[PDB]
Amino acid sequence: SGFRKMAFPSGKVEGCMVQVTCGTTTLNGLWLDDVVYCPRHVINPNYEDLLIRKSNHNFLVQAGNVQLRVIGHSMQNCVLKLKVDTANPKTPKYKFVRIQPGQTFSVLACYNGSPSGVYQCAMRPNFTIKGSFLNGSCGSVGFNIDYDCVSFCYMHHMELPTGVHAGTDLEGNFYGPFVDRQTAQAAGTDTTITVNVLAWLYAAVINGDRWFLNRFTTTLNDFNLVAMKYNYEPLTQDHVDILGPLSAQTGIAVLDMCASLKELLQNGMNGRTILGSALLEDEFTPFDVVRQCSGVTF
Amino acid sequence: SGFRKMAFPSGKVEGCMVQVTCGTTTLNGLWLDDVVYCPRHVICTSEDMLNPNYEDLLIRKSNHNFLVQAGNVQLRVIGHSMQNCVLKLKVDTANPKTPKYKFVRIQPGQTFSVLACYNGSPSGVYQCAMRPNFTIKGSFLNGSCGSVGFNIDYDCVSFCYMHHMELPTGVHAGTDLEGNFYGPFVDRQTAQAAGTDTTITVNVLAWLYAAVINGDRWFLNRFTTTLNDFNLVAMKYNYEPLTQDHVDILGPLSAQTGIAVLDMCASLKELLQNGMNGRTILGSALLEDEFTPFDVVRQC
Numbered sequence: 001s002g003f004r005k006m007a008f009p010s011g012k013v014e015g016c017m018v019q020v021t022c023g024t025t026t027l028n029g030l031w032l033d034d035v036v037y038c039p040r041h042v043i044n045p046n047y048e049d050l051l052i053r054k055s056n057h058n059f060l061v062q063a064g065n066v067q068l069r070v071i072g073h074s075m076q077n078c079v080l081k082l083k084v085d086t087a088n089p090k091t092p093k094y095k096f097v098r099i100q101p102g103q104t105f106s107v108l109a110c111y112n113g114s115p116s117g118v119y120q121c122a123m124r125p126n127f128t129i130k131g132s133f134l135n136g137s138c139g140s141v142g143f144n145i146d147y148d149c150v151s152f153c154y155m156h157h158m159e160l161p162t163g164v165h166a167g168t169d170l171e172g173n174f175y176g177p178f179v180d181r182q183t184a185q186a187a188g189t190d191t192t193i194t195v196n197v198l199a200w201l202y203a204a205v206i207n208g209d210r211w212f213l214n215r216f217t218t219t220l221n222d223f224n225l226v227a228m229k230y231n232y233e234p235l236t237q238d239h240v241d242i243l244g245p246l247s248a249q250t251g252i253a254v255l256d257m258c259a260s261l262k263e264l265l266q267n268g269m270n271g272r273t274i275l276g277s278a279l280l281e282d283e284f285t286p287f288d289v290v291r292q293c294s295g296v297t298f
Numbered sequence: 299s300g301f302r303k304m305a306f307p308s309g310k311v312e313g314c315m316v317q318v319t320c321g322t323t324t325l326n327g328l329w330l331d332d333v334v335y336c337p338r339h340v341i342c343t344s345e346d347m348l349n350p351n352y353e354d355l356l357i358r359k360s361n362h363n364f365l366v367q368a369g370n371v372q373l374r375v376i377g378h379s380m381q382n383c384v385l386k387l388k389v390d391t392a393n394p395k396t397p398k399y400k401f402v403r404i405q406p407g408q409t410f411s412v413l414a415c416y417n418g419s420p421s422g423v424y425q426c427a428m429r430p431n432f433t434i435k436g437s438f439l440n441g442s443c444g445s446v447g448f449n450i451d452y453d454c455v456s457f458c459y460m461h462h463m464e465l466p467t468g469v470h471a472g473t474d475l476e477g478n479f480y481g482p483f484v485d486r487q488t489a490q491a492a493g494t495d496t497t498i499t500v501n502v503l504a505w506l507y508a509a510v511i512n513g514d515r516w517f518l519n520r521f522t523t524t525l526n527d528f529n530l531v532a533m534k535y536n537y538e539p540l541t542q543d544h545v546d547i548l549g550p551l552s553a554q555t556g557i558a559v560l561d562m563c564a565s566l567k568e569l570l571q572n573g574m575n576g577r578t579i580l581g582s583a584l585l586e587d588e589f590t591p592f593d594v595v596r597q598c
């Protein structure tokens with residue numbers, strides 16, 4: 001029993017964290033094989049022009065107490081790729097994935113190439129992450145683990161004026177309408193990830209919390225009309241299908257849980273809590289709930 | 299900026315997780331040097347659950363009764379001993395991934411990261427606090443026994459918990475790495491109930507200082523209070539008493555935010571009296587008590 005925000009074991013990623021120094025700037029790099037990936041801001045910035053002026057010895061890559069010698073440098077979007085003479089002997093089975101809003105991942109927050117903490121995030125519908133990062137965290141990576149394969153999906157680049165965070169996939173493409181320049185940028189109004197709230201309500205039913213369950217069911221259109229009005233993301237047929245296993249396990253049809261959620265939005269908690277929380281949690285996907293309520297290991 | 303429940307990077311602990319099998323029972327073990335630590339109830343039968351004599355069950359065991367598996371390699375058990383509720387299985391191979399480590403017994407209110415394992419395989423990492431009633435509100439299924447709680451201070455892993463059991467309310471009970479249970483619990487199927495849980499007041503205050511550091515000020519007020527008056531209000535809400543040690547420990551956050559401890563205490567008094575009024579503090583609609591003063595300073 002119990003439900004916790006749970007991050008993937010960060011070990012496979014910790015063995016990849018290196019420190020990247022370019023002049024006065026020091027941030028984190030992801031060392032996979034003989035390549036170190038880091039935010040290109042480490043170098044109104046014309047990055048292509050700044051990078052051609054750089055030489056290999058300008059970059060100092062430090063992996064623990066060993067300095068790696070940079071033998072090449074190239075830029076892929078907002079990410080810098082520093083070729084090194086040494087392949088990372090701790091390189092796990094990995095792949096680069098671009099996630100969609102609503103999807104969750106573990107963040108390994110690093111400072112000076114040293115892992116300091118691990119936490120579970122969701123890519124907000126406005127393409128920001130509500131992370132916890134201080135200056136020096138740039139280059140910290142977001143990942144998931146599938147069997148024994150690390151899926152790298154995020155690299156930290158910046159903090160927006162509201163305290164939310166913005167970054168890219170491992171191909172340097174930003175999540176959202178953000179740029180890596182010192183310019184006025186604001187995240188769009190955030191919305192609730194409806195499919196993740198429903199997944200979390202199924203987790204509460206699995207943990208014995210049933211007070212919110214009602215006799216009612218709704219049409220998907222009627223639910224979306226109500227949810228849209230409360231700044232909740234629309235629920236698609238894909239979301240209903242993905243919630244199928246939890247619906248089968250708890251005996252609560254997806255549109256049955258939607259009618260419970262419909263009431264929760266129009267009326268509130270009435271002083272009650274679900275899984276120890278007084279707000280509807282949206283940073284647990286349907287797969288996260290299945291994994292935690294079934295004991296899948298990595 | 300931002301505030302998250304943050305666990306320690308679990309890598310140094312993952313390299314120690316092994317599977318321990320004794321007959322039909324399979325749980326997790328912590329492999330440090332040439333010793334594997336695990337809950338002693340791995341030696342229990344279906345008959346020896348309500349009132350097992352572990353000393354008597356262990357003397358009947360031989361080294362070949364324990365199967366220790368570290369990845370796809372079986373470790374040879376060359377000795378077995380019991381230290382309180384933990385079993386220590388001596389192996390003929392020192393763990394080459396053994397980090398700098400130490401065994402620490404924590405106090406209620408203290409936080410630690412839990413690496414939940416099944417069959418010696420790490421499945422997830424989360425953050426916990428030792429509740430004032432000596433239970434942990436973990437996330438554990440059957441097979442998680444032997445999962446460990448830890449903190450990391452520069453290169454060194456402080457092991458502070460090993461998971462043993464789930465109480466009838468869904469809360470979890472376990473021991474330090476010397477086998478001494480946290481709380482009035484025993485590793486038997488006997489009727490056991492956790493005491494009524496209370497809020498870790500010092501951690502709530504620490505979390506309110508984190509909210510001020512992050513720009514949240516709506517809950518602040520012009521009032522101060524005496525420590526005794528605060529404790530009288532706090533107990534009525536099932537909050538732990540705040541001691542002078544707690545006030546002293548909150549000193550650095552008080553200095554950093556310019557809000558005296560007794561001033562923040564009057565803010566907590568008001569929050570307990572009115573509630574949130576539809577507002578949130580650090581994205582939460584309830585007062586969080588699983589961030590210590592030390593955690594808040596480290597994260598900020």
Ligand SMILES: CC(=O)Nc1ccc(N(Cc2cccc(Cl)c2)C(=O)Cc2cncc3ccccc23)cn1
Binds near residue numbers: 183
């Ligand atoms: C050398 C140095 O100070 N570098 C630095 C400083 C500041 C930043 N910026 C601003 C910035 C401005 C133009 C473009 C971009 Cl992409 C980024 C960041 O956002 C980094 C950052 C990340 N996460 C949490 C943070 C908390 C406090 C302060 C900074 C944080 C980057 N590099």
Ligand SMILES: CC(=O)Nc1ccc(N(Cc2cccc(Cl)c2)C(=O)Cc2cncc3ccccc23)cn1
Binds near residue numbers: 339441464465484
């Ligand atoms: C073979 C088998 O089922 N083993 C088993 C079953 C039950 C238990 N007990 C009870 C018990 C009983 C005698 C002594 C002690 Cl110390 C403990 C547990 O509490 C294990 C456990 C741990 N964490 C989360 C759990 C979630 C659901 C069910 C069990 C969980 C142990 N082994």
Ligand SMILES: [Cl-]
Binds near residue numbers: 242243245286287
């Ligand atoms: Cl699923």
